[PDB]
């Protein structure tokens, strides 16, 4: 059914499927310890995860997949998806990451957690890049869907996934042409957007090794769901 949608219908479907922005826990006395920051972030990430899973079901084509393939794709892409969402909502806050409306952090606060500032810097650089490209909401939702379908497709049905992926590419180009971009500008912008996905994969892998580290350090107990999504990368 995803294959018969127009570009504008694809955009509407994706826009409509967007998960909500969640709030962090409250009056958690600034300043943060390593343990308290990790606590908040873990609690937040866990809740975002539940919403992401339901968002995925609303991504055209995704439900046409077998359960096993849906699981595979989500286990592969979950952190990439949380990350791109984070940088998207951080766009209008240069220098800071908007984990939640009531939790906006700069890199100095990322120092409170051992090894986190490196990933912070990369997330901020990504936000800065989106900002400079003037990334649009319609483009963002396309990218996030691409991540869901693409990241795990090579560790496998595949043909259908690639068809859907092709459709989203069509959708992206459609959008750029509407913005008045020339043919050359369209392929250049398409290229630029898709190359950032490589950096996002990178941030995810570095973030992953790291969640594993803190688990080991058992500073804060990770949620059952996070641990599951985490162990899948092993």
């Amino acid at each position: 059914l995803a294959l018969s949608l127009t570009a504008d219908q694809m955009v509407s479907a994706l826009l409509d499927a967007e998960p909500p922005i969640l709030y962090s826990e409250y009056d958690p006395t600034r300043p943060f310890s390593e343990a308290s920051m990790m606590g908040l972030l873990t609690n937040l990430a866990d809740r975002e995860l539940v919403h992401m899973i339901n968002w995925a079901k609303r991504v055209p084509g995704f439900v046409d997949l077998t359960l096993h393939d849906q699981v595979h794709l989500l286990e592969c892409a979950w952190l990439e998806i949380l990350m791109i969402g984070l940088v998207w909502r951080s766009m209008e806050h240069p220098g800071k990451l908007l984990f939640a409306p009531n939790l906006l952090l700069d890199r100095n606060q990322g120092k409170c957690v051992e090894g986190m500032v490196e990933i912070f810097d990369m997330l901020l650089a990504t936000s800065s890049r989106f900002r400079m490209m003037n990334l649009q909401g319609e483009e963002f939702v396309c990218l996030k869907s691409i991540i869901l379908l693409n990241s795990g497709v090579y560790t496998f049905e595949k043909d259908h996934i690639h068809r859907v992926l092709d459709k989203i590419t069509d959708t992206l180009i459609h959008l750029m042409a509407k913005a008045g971009l020339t043919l050359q500008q369209q392929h250049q912008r398409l290229a630029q957007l898709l190359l950032i996905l490589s950096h996002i994969r990178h941030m995810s892998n570095k973030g992953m090794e790291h969640l594993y580290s803190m688990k080991c350090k058992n500073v804060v107990p990770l949620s059952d769901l996070l641990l599951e999504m985490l162990d899948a990368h092993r």
Partner: peptide, 10 residues
């Protein structure tokens, strides 16, 4: 068994 499984089939 997976929590993901449950969340996925709701």
């Amino acid at each position: 068994h997976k929590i993901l499984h449950r969340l996925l089939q709701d």
